Design a protein around this nucleic acid. Structure first.
Ligand code: MG
Ligand code: ZN
Lengths: 232, 41, 973, 661, 96
RNA sequence: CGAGAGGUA
DNA sequence: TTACCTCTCG
């Protein structure tokens, strides 16, 4: 199992260098590098080696596949390959069904939530620190974009941001340069009711890039958003 | 949405009153949903 | 004797099963019939099973389909009744009933419908040991006894020796008590069982106790025992043996069974089902006979044996089986392939079988036992994926229900070889190799190594240690996968898609054979039933479009032909002659060809010139651009026939004196076909009326309402929106037809017929198409057709490349076209643009592949509605294009509209458009006048119904509105 | 702001016997009451007329054909000025056949019966109120056992005060002989109890305020030595502990809720309006007759047998009545909720019969199947095709589909232009496919949008709106860039079309559901319509570049591109005239300010001359400067492909600007 | 994958999602009562349980999505999480 | 109209 | 899981 995995993996690693150095304009490279179609794994199978396969019950089969589709798989190899294919077909059918149940149920819990008021009046906010979790800067940025601040942030005697101000990528970056660690943000968990939300707590809309308007169905959008990525 | 008989019985006994404040409920009644253009402001 | 040395006929299983039922099955069921007498003593009836005769069919098969009858056979059996009073004997042969007959192809004609019975896979009776991992500490073990009845018998041993039956819902029941129920002495038990101490420390019959012959044999094998085969019972010794094994596992000496193996499963068939039904029917005849005996007493009359028995029980049972059983299905007659494939199907589901939603994930994967028996690729996708499958080419059914795969013995013996068929169990114990003997080093051939299977595993061993070899090319696959060329170079996922698409092809008006094929097209045509083959040797004496006369040794035989006839799937069947007058024929040779067949081979598509390149976006995603030549030279035109039937201004121009439309009329939507009760044309049917049939009928209480049937033919050409496909998993929908001048063109001047996107192959992993297109170009130029068997790389590395490149070169040299083989970029050439005359920049792939046209066409698909008929209770629009109905806005769609915030749009869909009667009738008026539509206040019917239904279960729902201004409460109705 | 206030409410409640009556009662001109249906007859035996006192009777449920009474004469409804609402000969209710949809009827039952739901639940509502063993209350209900002290409301001379007792062997005949005729009846009613009349009566005289008092005290006493015993025991202590809370709660609600506890056992029984159970002749349908009707007849029958039995045979013993009491109860049970007790209750040929609870429950239950979604008019379907030349706001609709969807609108037009006299006149013109019909269709659809959806509508983008363009052919053409949202490919996918009728609806579609307005996805903010496949290939090729060193020259350039262009237009031109190729390097004068993205690289060579000009050669650019330190010229090394993309983006911006003006 | 998300959202067992979490919640509740009084102890204990639970549940669902390259914003998960975590249960000892 | 079966995406 | 289509059968 080990000798064969290493051989397959080295070959995959070396495919891109070969194309970029020796044949830059080959059709297979253009299609993959561009982003148009193909994935490195898919190409590896056409031009390298298909590799070790997993039998039902998760056990490797012990006969390596040393061939690619151009060269042509042997009868024995083809049969082993079929194993994987039944797994895919069974998974696709199942995944389509499971997703729908999760979505129906998620919409039901949160269907009633609409934005009904401008300010709840809360003076509480969650605090986000770069530390307190080991957070890659990416995570820190993504949490913060789109939220309204619940307290002023100051560097020395100057105010970087004031309460009731939205945070965008430029502000987030200033906070990173100046290392302002405790930032307090209004968040759905900080609002004063459970039958509705306020504009300031929810924050900027994903669609139009401005504060959410009164009358929007935040709940139906949340259910759908968690669920649709489910097919993948 | 799930246990229809059981809910309906408990309610009939208690005389439950529903103020129609959500989306699905107003759909059954065929009336304007209180969201978007429907939310009145 | 068959299948060794040749591919077996594709319908052999059906033929054998039917024969077994006709003789062995009939006799066995007949024997069990009880002699019947009543009360203290009464008259005795005797059914003598010794003399049963089955007589020939009264109507011929063709007539049966024409008059909607059932092709059957009559059973006459001899019987005698000794009236208790009489003491004398009267004997006659009664007509018990009608048993259906099969055509050799394997179909039954019942009430005018071709019907086929599918095979089923179920768990075999026997003892199975499973180790259930235990939630606390050490694992529990169990045994189970599957039976023909289906009752399962459970015995279990815990960490503390338990030997407790689990059949009772209760935790503890004693196996030892069951042994004592058998009269065994406690002392007797001890002498019999090994592991006595452990059991010492420890100090129904109707259903479970019967084990079929299959059940008994399995028991004897698993627990070695040798009770003789005639014995078929749960004799007690067996139970003791089971316990003995159960404890051995606890100590380490045992095997836990795999229930997915095919040695543990059995196959039922046509024969079994038919025999079963005969039994049910027979029990019903006993009920009828007893009843007529009672009637005789009332009238005090001397019985005639016939009077006692009617023919109703046999006929009714079968009529019901064919009509309502899950595994009896109507034959697909879309094309010749569909007819051959349907018979070979195997299902896990069925009566007394698994259900799809219920079944486990593990039952739906391939097992190593399936090879040679069930095809790995074919399955039906959906919630039923993995549970319906297909038999492989060289499989057969054994004495027991098990399947068998042929193997060649390479072990030295006098003959040194024989082909044998092996049961799913037997071959796990031999080493089987599929490699070849073409390797030699400084040592001898016997020492060379090869990959092999042994005990459900793959290993590498020397050629000396192998026992059996697998030799046939098409052995591990079904008919559809065996019709794809260069399958080795296509990923397996695609192969499922490909087998599925061939089945959906439409027989075309003129047929043509493929340039590249696999060679099984020839046998597929022989076994479809669409060809006319000779039944006797002879010389052809007369030929006319309707008939052929064959004259052999003083006899003349007339063979009828089929002209323009409909099929179950609205496709046309037409036979065309292949034999010139004056020619000698031997039995089995072809005389006429059917649709989708040319020269004895299956021909479902055409060969066209194609290029793979991007073209202005017309090919985006999976769409195709095509030339007009295909439209005006009629390459892809097909004929479709539909039937419309009934039971008994400009319009009425066609009708005759009786009022039925005449033959040869061209009709359009709206026109009456048969004269208030008038039958009229639906949307989209416009065709010549090829025939009208006033069919008188029998069977109903009244003379059955004579049925008038009209048959209409539509000729259909290729259009934007049609679906076309190749044999390698490639499918697309036509997007534009362009004039020849604007099409891309070659260095020969010719213009390509179709253009396909080239970004598809990397994602879908089919490199087979590239090999097939290129070989096609060569054959056209050199006048050759190629039939190549699968897996050619066995001979050498890169074998396919060597074939394609060599052939392309020969074509290039013989006809002097240098572009066919280009040494710098082989297989690709440089082409030009029709619009501007300029060369495209990079070289492109050009070839002639074989493309097929699918049954899903745009004309069937299009639908529209405004107004219309409404349903009775829900008062909502009707469902279906045929029914002129609406489309559904369902749960998911509402949610989306809600996300947008479009309340007004949604309300409309829920009220005016669907189910608000008062409101709906108004909108049609406002619109014609030009006014504004008000927003509705009352409730839709849907709501009103709910209230009424609830008020039926004694609950009340009311809607009230409280006015904000004055606080009054008003009850809406 | 002061909110605009709307208050609406929905109330659900169990109903009294008097109400069920009022739902179904009318008094005729004769002054005679109508409504109870007694006979089980459905229609007539081969007459196809509803029978009287039948499940489909006109008089109780309304007329079948408008204006045609039982007799067969026709008086014009729409006029009540001189029309007998009820004819002397028959109850006619002349106005409409619609009533058969909404009118209700009721059936009187001799024996009190019990609803299934209250009894079936493990925390039975009736049991919670009773405070007696569940088995005891149930045993009396389904088997013959007799209570002995039914009412605590009134004093009784006999005093065993017993529960349900199987044995009536106690002297009962001598007791009756000693007692007066019906003296026994007064005593028996007070004491002996049977069936469910007993439950109804025990429930009816009960003291709720008292019930709370006892319960709280018992609840307080329990818990003595709580949480201090063997596992088995505590469990039991708790289960009682809760039954107690649950019971207090039910009673409290009853005190303040206006629903009477006795209504659970039922005196009258309701009947669904006749249409909702079509039971049309099973003329080959074979299932046209409703199982509703089949179940209804059974209850009707057993009840009639009992009413007669009592009237016919006072002499016959309670054994005759007892036998059929149970029978009546069981029919009602199956009608209300069969399968609750798990009884199959099925005809052998038939499947287990459909209880009314089944009708409501599930996906196909009324609420999910009909209430949440429904079929609609003005809709169509067809396969989809690529449509590359279309703009983002447009879609192509086959003409045959359109004529169906926009027909009403075209008829108006034909009449308005006076090309036809009447609605019928116009419909004819539409059929002959005359050429004018097509000019009118085109005019009508010009500013009217349409809505398109794909079948699995996972997310909002599943439905979008477009302006329709007429096309010939039978498939719908869609823009290439809208396919990601719809998750559509062109290999057999189909779509559906809907037309928005109202002005209000039409505004919403143009302003809130068009693609230009929805270019960002809901989940993280990403672009949803971006160039994707072939389009991406083309963009990559244009910007890919050229061979740089060993690839372009065989031998070192040491031992030993040229074109210089002044404006970008010239360069694009040379490409067309084939003077240069896409990848050939060229130099372009740049008059603007150094916007070229390039690495931070210092100059490869600076060449400086004595009079003062300096030339600086960087890899992609040459900057010429002078003594006064002014940049005389800038030249960029590039390829034609790069200039083509820039030009398109720039021109589009300027073009949109010049159009607005 | 998806099964895990169904498990996290449908909280059949509190410990099932995180062992470290069950520990804390059972522990907190026993300990808090001794330290603080009746008006204030239940309230503070609730606030602490609510805070840890909320962080963990969002973080667990999110890790599953980030492994496979699917990026969904937090606000959306928070609307759903709140409903799961918004209610309290009055105890056996409490009758009024 | 109630069941069953074969497909499609 | 959704939607779509055809058929047979009492
Ligand atoms: Mg598709
Ligand atoms: Zn090959």
């Amino acid at each position: 199992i080990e000798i064969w995995y290493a051989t397959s993996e080295y070959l995959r690693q070396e495919m891109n260098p070969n194309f970029r150095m020796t044949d830059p304009f080959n059709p297979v490279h253009i299609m993959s590098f561009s982003g148009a179609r193909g994935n490195a794994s898919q190409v590896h199978q056409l031009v390298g080696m298909r590799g070790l396969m997993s039998d039902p019950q998760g056990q490797m089969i012990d006969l390596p596949i040393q061939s690619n589709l151009r060269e042509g798989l042997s009868l024995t190899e083809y049969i082993i390959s079929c194993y994987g294919a039944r797994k895919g077909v069974v998974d696709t059918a199942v995944r389509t069904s499971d997703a729908g149940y999760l979505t129906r149920r998620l919409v039901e819990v949160v269907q009633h939530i609409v934005v009904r008021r401008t300010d709840c009046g809360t003076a509480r906010g969650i605090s986000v620190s770069p530390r307190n979790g080991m957070m890659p800067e990416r995570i820190f940025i993504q949490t913060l974009i789109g939220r309204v601040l619940a307290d002023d942030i100051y560097m020395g005697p100057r105010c970087i941001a004031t309460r009731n101000q939205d945070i965008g990528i430029g502000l987030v970056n200033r906070f990173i340069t100046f290392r302002a660690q405790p930032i307090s943000i209004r968040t759905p968990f900080t609002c004063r009711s459970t039958s509705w939300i306020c504009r300031l707590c929810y924050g900027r809309s994903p669609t139009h890039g401005d504060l959410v308007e009164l009358g929007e169905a935040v709940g139906i959008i949340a259910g759908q958003s968690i669920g649709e990525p489910g097919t993948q | 949405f799930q246990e229809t008989a059981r809910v309906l019985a408990k309610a009939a006994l208690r005389g439950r009153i529903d103020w129609l404040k959500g989306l699905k409920e107003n759909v059954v009644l065929g009336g304007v949903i209180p969201v978007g253009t429907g939310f009145k402001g | 004797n068959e299948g060794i040395s040749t591919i077996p006929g594709f319908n052999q299983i059906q033929f054998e099963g039917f024969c077994r039922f006709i003789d062995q099955g009939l006799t066995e069921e007949l024997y069990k019939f009880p002699k019947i007498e009543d009360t203290d003593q009464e008259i005795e009836f005797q059914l003598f099973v010794e003399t049963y005769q089955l007589v020939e069919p009264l109507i011929k098969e063709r007539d049966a389909v024409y008059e909607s009858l059932t092709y059957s056979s009559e059973l006459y059996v001899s019987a005698g009744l000794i009236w208790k009073n009489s003491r004398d004997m009267q004997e006659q042969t009664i007509f018990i009933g009608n048993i259906p007959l099969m055509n050799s192809l394997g179909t039954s004609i019942v009430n005018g419908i071709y019907r086929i019975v599918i095979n089923q896979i179920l768990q075999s009776p026997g003892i199975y040991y499973r180790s259930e991992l235990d939630h606390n500490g050490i694992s529990v073990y169990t045994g189970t006894i599957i039976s023909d009845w289906g009752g399962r018998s459970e015995l279990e041993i815990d960490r503390k020796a338990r030997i407790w039956a689990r059949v009772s819902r209760k935790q503890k029941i004693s196996i030892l008590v069951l042994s004592s129920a058998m009269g065994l002495n406690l002392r007797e038990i001890l002498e019999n069982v090994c592991y006595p101490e452990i059991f010492l420390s420890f100090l129904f019959f109707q259903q479970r106790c019967e084990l079929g012959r299959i059940g008994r044999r399995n028991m004897n094998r698993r627990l070695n025992l040798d009770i003789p085969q005639n014995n078929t019972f749960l004799l007690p010794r067996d139970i003791l043996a089971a316990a003995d094994h159960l404890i051995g596992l606890k100590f380490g000496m045992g095997a836990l069974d795999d229930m997915n193996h095919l040695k543990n499963k059995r196959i039922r068939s046509v024969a079994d089902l038919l025999q079963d039904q005969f039994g049910l029917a027979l029990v019903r005849l006993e009920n009828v006979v007893r009843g007529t005996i009672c009637g005789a007493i009332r009238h005090k009359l001397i019985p005639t044996p016939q009077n006692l028995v009617t023919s109703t029980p046999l006929t009714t049972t079968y009529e019901s089986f064919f009509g309502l059983h899950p595994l009896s299905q109507v034959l697909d007659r879309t094309n010749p392939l569909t007819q051959i494939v349907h018979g070979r199907k195997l299902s896990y589901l069925g009566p007394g079988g698994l259900t799809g939603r219920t079944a486990s994930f593990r039952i739906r994967d391939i097992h190593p036992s399936h090879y040679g028996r069930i095809c790995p690729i074919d399955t039906s996708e959906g919630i039923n994926v993995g549970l319906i499958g297909s038999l492989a080419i060289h499989a057969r059914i054994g004495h027991w229900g098990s399947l068998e795969s042929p193997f060649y013995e390479i072990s030295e013996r006098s003959t040194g070889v024989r082909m044998l068929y092996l049961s799913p169990g037997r071959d796990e114990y031999y080493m089987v190799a599929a490699g070849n003997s073409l390797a030699l080093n400084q040592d001898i051939q016997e020492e060379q190594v090869v990959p092999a299977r042994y005990r459900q595993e793959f290993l590498t061993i020397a050629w000396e240690q192998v026992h059996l070899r697998s030799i046939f090319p098409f052995q591990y696959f079904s008919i559809g996968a065996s019709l794809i060329p260069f399958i080795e170079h296509n990923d397996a996922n695609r192969a499922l898609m490909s087998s599925n698409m061939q089945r959906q092809a439409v027989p075309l008006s003129r047929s043509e054979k493929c340039i590249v094929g696999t060679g099984l097209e020839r046998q597929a045509a022989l076994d479809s039933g669409a060809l006319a083959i000779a039944e006797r040797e002879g010389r052809v004496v007369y030929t006319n479009t309707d008939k052929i006369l064959l004259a052999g040794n003083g006899d003349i035989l007339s063979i009828p032909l089929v002209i323009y006839q409909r099929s179950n799937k609205n496709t046309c069947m037409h036979q065309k002659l292949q034999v010139p007058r004056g020619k000698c024929i031997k039995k089995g040779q072809i005389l006429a060809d059917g649709a989708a067949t040319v020269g004895g081979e299956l021909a479902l598509g055409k060969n066209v010139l194609v290029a793979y390149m991007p073209w202005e976006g017309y090919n985006s995603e999976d769409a195709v651009l095509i030339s007009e030549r295909l439209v005006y030279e009629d390459i892809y035109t097909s004929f479709h026939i539909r039937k419309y039937e009934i039971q008994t201004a400009h319009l009425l121009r066609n009708l005759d004196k009786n009022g039925i439309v005449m033959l040869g009329s061209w009709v359009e939507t709206g026109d009456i076909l048969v004269g208030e009760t008038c039958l009229k044309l639906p949307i989209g049917g416009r065709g010549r009326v090829i025939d009208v049939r006033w069919i008188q009928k029998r069977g109903g209480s009244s003379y059955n309402p004579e049925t008038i049937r009209v048959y209409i033919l539509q000729k259909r050409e290729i259009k934007v929106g049609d679906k076309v496909a190749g044999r390698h998993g490639n499918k697309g929908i036509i997007s534009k037809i362009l004039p020849r001048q604007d099409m891309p063109y070659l260095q020969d001047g010719r213009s390509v017929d179709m253009v396909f996107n080239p970004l598809g192959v990397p994602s879908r992993m089919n490199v087979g198409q590239i090999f097939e297109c290129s070989l096609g170009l060569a054959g056209s130029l050199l006048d050759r057709h190629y039939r190549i068997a699968p897996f050619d790389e066995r001979y050498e590395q890169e074998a396919s490349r060597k074939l394609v490149f060599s052939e392309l070169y020969e074509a290039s040299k013989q006809t002097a076209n240098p572009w066919v083989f280009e040494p710098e970029y082989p297989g690709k050439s440089r082409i030009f643009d029709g619009r501007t005359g300029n060369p495209f920049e990079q070289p492109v792939i050009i070839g002639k592949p074989y493309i097929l046209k699918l049954i899903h066409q745009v004309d069937d698909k299009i639908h529209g509605r405004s107004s219309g008929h409404y349903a009775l209770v829900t008062q909502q629009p009707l469902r279906g294009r045929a029914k002129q109905g609406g489309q559904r806005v369902g749960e998911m769609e509402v949610w989306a509209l809600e996300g947008f915030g479009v309340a007004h749009i949604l309300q409309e869909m829920l009220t005016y458009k669907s189910d608000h009667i008062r409101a709906r009738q108004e909108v049609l008026g406002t619109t014609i006048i030009g006014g504004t539509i008000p927003n509705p206040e009352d409730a839709p019917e849907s709501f009103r119904l709910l209230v009424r239904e609830l008020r039926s279960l004694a609950l009340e729902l009311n809607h009230f509105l409280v006015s904000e201004k004055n606080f009054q409460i008003n009850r809406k109705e | 702001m002061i909110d605009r206030y709307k208050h609406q409410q929905l109330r659900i409640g169990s109903v009294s016997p008097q109400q069920i009556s009022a739902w179904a009662t009318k008094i005729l001109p004769n002054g005679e009451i109508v409504g109870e249906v007694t006979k089980p007859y459905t229609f007539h035996y081969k007459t196809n007329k509803p029978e009287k006192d039948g499940l489909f009777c006109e008089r109780i449920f309304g007329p079948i054909k408008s204006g045609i009474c039982a007799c067969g004469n026709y008086r014009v409804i729409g006029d009540e000025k001189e029309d007998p609402k009820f004819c002397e000969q028959c109850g006619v209710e002349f106005v409409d056949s619609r009533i058969r949809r909404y009118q209700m009827g009721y059936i009187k039952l001799a024996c009190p019966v019990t609803h299934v739901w209250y009894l079936k639940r493990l925390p039975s509502y009736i049991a919670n109120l009773l405070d007696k063993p569940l088995k005891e209350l149930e045993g009396l209900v389904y088997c013959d056992f007799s209570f002995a002290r039914p009412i605590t409301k009134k004093p009784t001379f006999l005093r065993l005060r017993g529960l349900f007792e199987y044995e009536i062997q106690s002297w009962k005949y001598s007791i009756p002989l000693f007692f007066t005729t019906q003296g026994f009846d007064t005593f028996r009613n007070r004491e002996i109890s049977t069936g469910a009349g007993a439950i109804r009566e025990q429930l009816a005289d009960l003291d709720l305020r008292i019930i709370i008092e006892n319960s709280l005290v018992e609840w307080e006493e329990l818990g003595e030595e709580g949480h201090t015993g063997n596992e088995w025991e505590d469990r039991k202590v708790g289960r009682r502990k809760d039954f107690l809370v649950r019971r207090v709660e039910l009673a409290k609600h009853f005190i303040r809720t206006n629903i009477e506890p006795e209504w659970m056992v039922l005196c009258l029984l309701p009947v669904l309006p006749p249409e909702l159970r079509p039971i049309i002749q099973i003329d080959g349908g074979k299932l046209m007759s409703s199982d509703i009707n089949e179940l209804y007849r059974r209850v009707i029958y057993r009840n009639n047998t009992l009413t007669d039995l009592l009237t016919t045979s006072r002499s016959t013993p309670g054994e005759l009545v007892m036998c059929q009491e149970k029978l009546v109860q069981e029919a009602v049970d199956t009608l209300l909720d069969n399968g609750i007790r798990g009884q199959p209750m099925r005809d052998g040929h038939n499947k287990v019969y459909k209880s009314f609870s089944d009708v409501i429950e599930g996906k196909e239950g009324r609420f999910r199947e009909t209430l949440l979604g429904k079929r609609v008019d003005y809709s169509g379907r067809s396969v989809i095709v690529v449509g590359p030349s279309l703009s983002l706001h447009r879609c192509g609709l086959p003409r045959e589909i359109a004529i169906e969807l926009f027909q009403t609108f075209v008829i108006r037009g034909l009449i308005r232009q006076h090309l036809a006299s009447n609605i019928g006149v116009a419909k004819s013109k539409i059929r002959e496919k005359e050429p004018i019909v097509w000019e009118i269709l085109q005019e009508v659809m010009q500013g009217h949008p349409v809505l398109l959806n794909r079948a699995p509508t996972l997310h909002r983008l599943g439905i979008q709106a477009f302006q329709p363009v007429l096309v010939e052919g039978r498939a719908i053409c869609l823009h290439p860039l809208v396919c990601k949202g719809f998750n559509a490919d062109f290999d057999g996918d189909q779509m559906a079309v809907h037309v928005p009728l109202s002005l209000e609806a039409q505004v919403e579609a143009r302003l809130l559901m068009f693609s230009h307005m929805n270019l960002l996805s809901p989940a993280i903010g990403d672009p949803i319509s971006v160039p994707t496949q072939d389009m991406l290939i083309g963009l990559y090729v244009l910007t890919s570049g050229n061979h740089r060193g060993i690839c372009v020259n065989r031998y070192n350039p040491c031992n030993r591109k040229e074109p210089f262009f002044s404006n970008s237009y010239d360069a694009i031109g040379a490409y067309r005239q084939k003077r240069i190729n896409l990848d050939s390097p060229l130099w372009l004068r740049w008059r603007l300010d150094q916007r070229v993205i390039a690495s931070r690289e210092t100059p490869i060579e600076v060449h400086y001359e004595s009079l003062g000009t300096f030339y600086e050669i960087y890899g992609h650019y040459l900057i010429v400067r002078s003594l006064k330190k002014q940049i005389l010229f800038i030249y960029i090394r590039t390829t034609v492909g790069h200039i083509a993309l820039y030009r398109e983006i720039e021109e589009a911006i300027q073009g949109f600007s010049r159009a607005y003006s | 994958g998806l099964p895990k998300v169904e498990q996290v959202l449908e909280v059949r067992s509190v410990d099932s999602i995180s062992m470290n979490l069950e520990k804390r919640i059972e522990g907190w509740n026993k300990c808090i009562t001794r330290i603080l009084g009746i008006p204030w102890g239940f309230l503070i204990g609730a606030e602490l349980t609510i805070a840890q639970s909320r962080i963990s549940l969002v973080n667990k669902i999110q890790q599953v999505y980030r492994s496979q390259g699917v990026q969904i914003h937090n606000r959306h998960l928070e609307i759903i999480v709140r409903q799961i975590t918004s209610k309290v249960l009055v105890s056996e000892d409490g009758m009024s």
